[PDB]
């Protein structure tokens, strides 16, 4: 068994972390108490769930996680929330003044003052690990803390933990729920600085989740609560292999091995199905073929883009529930004859498949209905570069007029970092086109 430490940065990172750990406790049968009436080895063990949970002598199962935010009100809700008994106070780190949606403020000004504290708190969790394999970092692109402090943290983690893997769960900015005009700036600034420090990053576009909630959950005006509970289901599907007995993606290293052939191109597209409303009085359970076919619909992807006009480098299918290999292969065979799927020449046209017999766990009183089978597809397609193109274009529009730039310069950041970050993104787009377009 090798432990994984989760790090939640900023409002988005923290609130998503809240939803995830709540779901984890439900999946593993852990009460808000922290007690786990199925773990017969009291006060320790090396089971698969021990990757995410440590154990006290009193039988409390504590998340190997750190919550960091430069403003206390969000984490204060964790301190007084349902799972307050779950976390140790030392795991919850709060500042007094946030980064004001300013990358430079979160990275340079405030980041410099709190980075040693956070690393020390992370160090304490690492000391409890017999064989730490790496970190899972949750944050937004658009926030000052989520963008600025994360990139500094990722830089320092590479220094203090050079051999460890680092995976990201990043929230891509969407105007329908965005809170800042400068989020394109922050997104590109943090991508440029973090790019060489992340082994694998799962981007989630708020626009996609928002529309999925409206379309499939019949929610007129989705809140962060609605969004995060859906995201947590996808995150759970991805990390399930680290927490349960299995043979696919059993460690963080295998994520890079299976999904990321080219280091810089480490942004796999996630697609989830089925998403069914709990308010739906009558629903017909979808088959293996139906939910697998849904994995190739843009409406079900975490980032709206068109994989038909790109190329695949790798594809992983993660099933949960009543699923057997025979039905998967039969589904794949039919899909291959009806859909436009193109792998790059230097990669095999195939799928790595993982099945966990336990159907997805839903939050009692949540928006999601119980299904007998679900699937999350992780595919490294060049089509996800459409998201970079959108982001870079908004960057170019504002930066050409140097709009809002003075806010970043005023925090001690040099203006050259803007163009430096943008050039790196331009190179990234060019890499995708080289791999994906003939």
């Amino acid at each position: 068994m090798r432990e994984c430490i989760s790090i939640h940065v900023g409002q988005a990172g923290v609130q998503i972390g809240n939803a995830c750990w709540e779901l984890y406790c439900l999946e593993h049968g852990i009460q808000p108490d922290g007690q786990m009436p199925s773990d017969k080895t009291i006060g320790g063990g090396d089971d698969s769930f021990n990757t995410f949970f440590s154990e006290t002598g009193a039988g409390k199962h504590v998340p190997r996680a750190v919550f960091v935010d430069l403003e206390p009100t969000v984490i204060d809700e964790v301190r007084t929330g349902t799972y307050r008994q779950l976390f140790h106070p030392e795991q919850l780190i709060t500042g007094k003044e946030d980064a004001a949606n300013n990358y430079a403020r979160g990275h340079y000004t405030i980041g410099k003052e709190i980075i040693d504290l956070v690393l020390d708190r992370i160090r304490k969790l690492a000391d409890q690990c017999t064989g730490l394999q790496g970190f899972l970092v949750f944050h937004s692109f658009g926030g000052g803390t989520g963008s600025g402090f994360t990139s500094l943290l990722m830089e320092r983690l590479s220094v203090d933990y050079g051999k460890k893997s680092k995976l990201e769960f990043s929230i891509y900015p969407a105007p329908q729920v965005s809170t800042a005009v400068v989020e394109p700036y922050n997104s590109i600034l943090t991508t440029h600085t973090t790019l060489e420090h992340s082994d694998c990053a799962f981007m989630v576009d708020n626009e996609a989740i928002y529309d999925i909630c409206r379309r499939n959950l019949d929610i007129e005006r989705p809140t962060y609560t609605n969004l995060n509970r859906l995201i947590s289901q996808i995150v759970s599907s991805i990390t399930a292999s680290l927490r349960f007995d299995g043979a696919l993606n059993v460690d963080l290293t295998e994520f890079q091995t299976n999904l990321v052939p080219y280091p810089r191109i480490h942004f796999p597209l996630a697609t989830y199905a089925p998403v069914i409303s709990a308010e739906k009085a009558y629903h017909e359970q979808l088959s293996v073929a139906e939910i697998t076919n849904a994995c190739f619909e843009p409406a079900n992807q975490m980032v709206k883009c068109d994989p038909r006009h790109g190329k695949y480098m790798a594809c992983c299918l993660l099933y949960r529930g009543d699923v057997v290999p025979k039905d998967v292969n039969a589904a794949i065979a039919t899909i291959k004859t009806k859909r436009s799927i193109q792998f790059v020449d230097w990669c095999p046209t195939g799928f790595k498949v993982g099945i966990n017999y336990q159907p997805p766990t839903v939050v009692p009183g949540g928006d999601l209905a119980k299904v007998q089978r679900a699937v999350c597809m992780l595919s490294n397609t060049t089509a996800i570069a459409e998201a970079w193109a959108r982001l870079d274009h908004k960057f170019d529009l504002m930066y050409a007029k140097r709009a809002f730039v003075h806010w970043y310069v005023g925090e001690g950041m040099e203006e050259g970092e803007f163009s430096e970050a943008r050039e790196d993104m331009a190179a990234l787009e060019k890499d995708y086109e080289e791999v994906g377009v003939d």
């Binding site: 105007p175 329908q176 626009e207 409406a299 038909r308 436009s340 570069a385 274009h393």
Partner: protein
């Protein structure tokens, strides 16, 4: 009040389309950089499809299908037909074609060439991408130095009087629901010079495109205005000369070829469940031989129109492709 943008000022068809939209008083033209549009009349090259359908509160439509270039480039069209099981090698309405890169199908080319070399068959081939028609294969490869070498139809249907060859242009509109609309009006681009089966250097009687005829033919405009014969006259000719109609002898095959090509590429380019919608106007070019058999020669992704037919066709585009998505306050045959 709907909004649109124009990003191709050199397009004749959509310059008229944009004019009609404004004339309704219910469409507003925005700056070409304004992202808050309902309709995009996009550019021919590197259209930013990746930035479409990401504007909250806006239904967005574009006048081009992403991926339609596979059908509208000579090199890719050949590869599409030969590798698509819906079209396959057993495609009887597309001439024998091979993709030849400059300095590949060179080996299969010469092999099927030798089938005609010492087999006593017409071994005249045409090179396309600047066009050379030759019976010598070695001469073709000399000129090529991406190209495609296609079997030249040595026995075309010749119009009388004049012993004139021609090509048929059909305009096809595919809407956002992937309905295939064939414009009932087509046009024949005719060669005003007699057909010579020995003088291939004289390409003014072998190449039927309008520009060449206007430049090198002294008989330009003799038989019809601008070497353009329309369907009413051509149908009457087929009745008088060959005792048949345009619908039976030719249009049936044309409808078949159009559907076959577009239905083949449908799952790759359809915007059925996409976050933005697409339509596109296509220009199909056909050849007709002596046996009244129709051959497809190419597909144009950004076609112009006949001057006489601009008004009707462009209004039809507004009606079935634009207003169908954005209702205001048939000239097409549905295939």
């Amino acid at each position: 009040m709907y909004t649109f943008v124009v990003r191709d000022e050199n397009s004749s068809v959509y310059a008229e389309v944009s004019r009609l939209l404004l004339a309704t008083g219910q469409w507003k033209r925005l700056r070409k950089d304004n992202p808050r549009f309902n309709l995009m009349l996009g550019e021919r090259n590197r259209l930013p499809f990746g930035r479409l359908g990401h504007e909250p509160g806006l239904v967005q439509l574009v006048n081009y299908y992403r991926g339609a270039d596979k059908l509208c480039r000579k090199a890719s069209l050949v590869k599409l037909i030969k590798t698509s099981p819906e079209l396959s090698e057993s495609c009887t309405w597309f001439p024998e074609s091979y993709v030849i890169y400059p300095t590949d199908e060179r080996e299969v080319f010469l092999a099927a060439y030798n089938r005609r070399r010492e087999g006593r068959e017409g071994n005249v081939w045409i090179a396309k991408s600047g066009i050379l028609i030759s019976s010598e294969a070695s001469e073709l490869l000399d000129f090529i130095d991406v190209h495609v070498i296609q079997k030249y139809l040595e026995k075309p249907l010749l119009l009388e009087p004049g012993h004139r060859k021609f090509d048929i242009r059909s305009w096809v509109l595919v809407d956002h629901l992937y309905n295939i609309y064939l414009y009932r009006e087509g046009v024949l681009r005719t060669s005003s010079e007699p057909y010579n089966s020995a003088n291939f250097q004289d390409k003014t009687c072998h190449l039927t495109n309008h520009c060449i005829q206007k430049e090198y033919s002294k008989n330009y405009g003799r038989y019809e205005e601008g070497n353009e014969m329309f369907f009413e006259e051509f149908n009457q000719y087929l009745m008088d000369a060959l005792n048949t109609t345009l619908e039976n002898s030719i249009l049936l095959q044309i409808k078949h070829i159009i559907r076959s090509c577009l239905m083949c590429i449908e799952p790759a380019i359809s915007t059925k469940h996409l976050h933005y919608q697409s339509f596109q106007l296509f220009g199909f070019d056909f050849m007709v031989d002596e046996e009244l058999k129709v051959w497809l020669i190419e597909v144009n992704g950004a076609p112009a129109c006949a001057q006489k037919l601009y008004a009707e066709l462009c209004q039809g585009i507004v009606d079935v492709a634009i207003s169908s998505v954005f209702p205001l306050a048939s000239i097409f045959i549905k295939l």
